[PDB]
Design a protein around this ligand. Structure first.
Ligand SMILES: O[C@H]1[C@H](NCc2ccco2)[C@H]2CO[C@H](O2)[C@@H]1N1CCCCC1
Ligand SMILES: O[C@H]1[C@H](NCc2ccco2)[C@H]2CO[C@H](O2)[C@@H]1N1CCCCC1
Length: 330
């Protein structure tokens, strides 16, 4: 089997991407944030505290003839921004782009934090990291990909995120028309539950490539590119007037600037992020200070190749017995 679904930016800045997902019978279609940095499939639901729902589409398990309460199961998750959600669990039929999994754990939110309520465009998360991170207790549950894997033509999924445009998540096949040149594969450590790999270095603009190992995660659920402070300083030093602002929460730059590209290494290959991809716009409406798309990972404890980096590439998440990651230009 295979699946193929279009993923669409939620706003003009590509802050996140939503992908339609069919849950239950008859189908209830919710727009989920596919997140290769986490491992829970959770949704706004008929059980979510009413005051915490503001425009999201909800899953109503009582209206699905295939929903079954997973008795005694609960979940609770916190993410990097201090956002969180929690609830109970149903199993139900879940389809993505024509690929169907029966008995998928669908984590129904009873509570969500304010940042979720305030974002009407995201109806929940679909985790695509390793199932060892799944938060369901007392019986940990498998991700959609983990459940689908054995049925897939090939045990892979791919992320092809667009810059200011829709893109594609494919399951079970590699679309050889979707990238240029060859795909370079690189080793993954699953020890922290992430698609964790080691970049071979970086360049800023037309500058020379610096060979240096940068361990980090391929994370479709994080907007920006978070790298060591040394690397980030070297980038922003090439932008007149850029500075790190503790009051804003990172590097900002004059909106009048033209940003340089940023290149990262994948083995001997190179992925170039155009400068425009690094512009996240005015810090507040009408400001001439713009927020940077490359930020320091100091304090996070891990480097994160988020959407800013991934959208410059065609990315293969290879879930073979020994997982690997592939990157191609496009
Ligand atoms: O891990 C990500 C999260 N990803 C999943 C998620 C939840 C809601 C949408 O996506 C979201 C919510 O908190 C932040 O962004 C967090 N943060 C991003 C900056 C670098 C450190 C980690
Ligand atoms: O909230 C984000 C904004 N998000 C997109 C956006 C624009 C308007 C609404 O949402 C953009 C523009 O400025 C920054 O990045 C701002 N900043 C991030 C670091 C600390 C928290 C505040």
């Amino acid at each position: 089997s295979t699946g193929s679904a279009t993923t669409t930016p939620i706003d003009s800045l590509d802050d996140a991407y939503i992908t339609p997902v069919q849950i239950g019978t008859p189908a209830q279609t919710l727009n989920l944030d596919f997140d290769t940095g986490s491992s829970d499939l959770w949704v706004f639901s008929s059980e979510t505290t009413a005051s915490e729902v503001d425009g999201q589409t909800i899953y109503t398990p009582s209206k699905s003839t295939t929903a079954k309460l997973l008795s005694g199961a609960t979940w609770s998750i916190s993410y990097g921004d201090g956002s969180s959600s929690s609830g109970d669990v149903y199993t139900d039929t879940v389809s993505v782009g024509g690929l169907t999994v029966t008995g998928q754990a669908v984590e129904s939110a009873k509570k969500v934090s304010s940042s979720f309520t305030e974002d009407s465009t995201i109806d929940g998360l679909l985790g695509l990291a390793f199932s060892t991170l799944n938060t369901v207790s007392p019986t940990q549950q498998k991700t959609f990909f983990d459940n689908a894997k054995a049925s897939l033509d090939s045990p892979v999924f791919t992320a092809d995120l667009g810059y200011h445009a829709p893109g594609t998540y494919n399951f079970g096949f590699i679309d050889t028309t979707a990238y240029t040149g060859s795909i370079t594969y690189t080793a993954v450590s699953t020890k922290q539950g992430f698609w964790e790999w080691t970049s071979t270095g970086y360049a800023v603009g037309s500058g020379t490539f610096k060979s240096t190992s940068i361990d980090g995660i391929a994370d479709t659920g994080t907007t920006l590119l978070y790298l060591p402070a040394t690397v980030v300083s070297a980038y922003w030093a090439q932008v007149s007037g850029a500075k790190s602002s503790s009051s804003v929460g990172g590097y900002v730059f004059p909106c009048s600037a033209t940003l340089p590209s940023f290149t990262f290494g994948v083995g001997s290959a190179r992925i170039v992020i155009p400068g425009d991809y690094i512009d996240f716009g005015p810090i507040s409406t009408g400001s001439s200070s713009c927020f940077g798309g490359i930020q320091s990972s100091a304090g996070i404890g891990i480097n994160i190749f988020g959407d800013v980096a991934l959208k410059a590439a065609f990315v293969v998440f290879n879930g073979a017995t020994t997982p690997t990651l592939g990157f191609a230009s496009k």
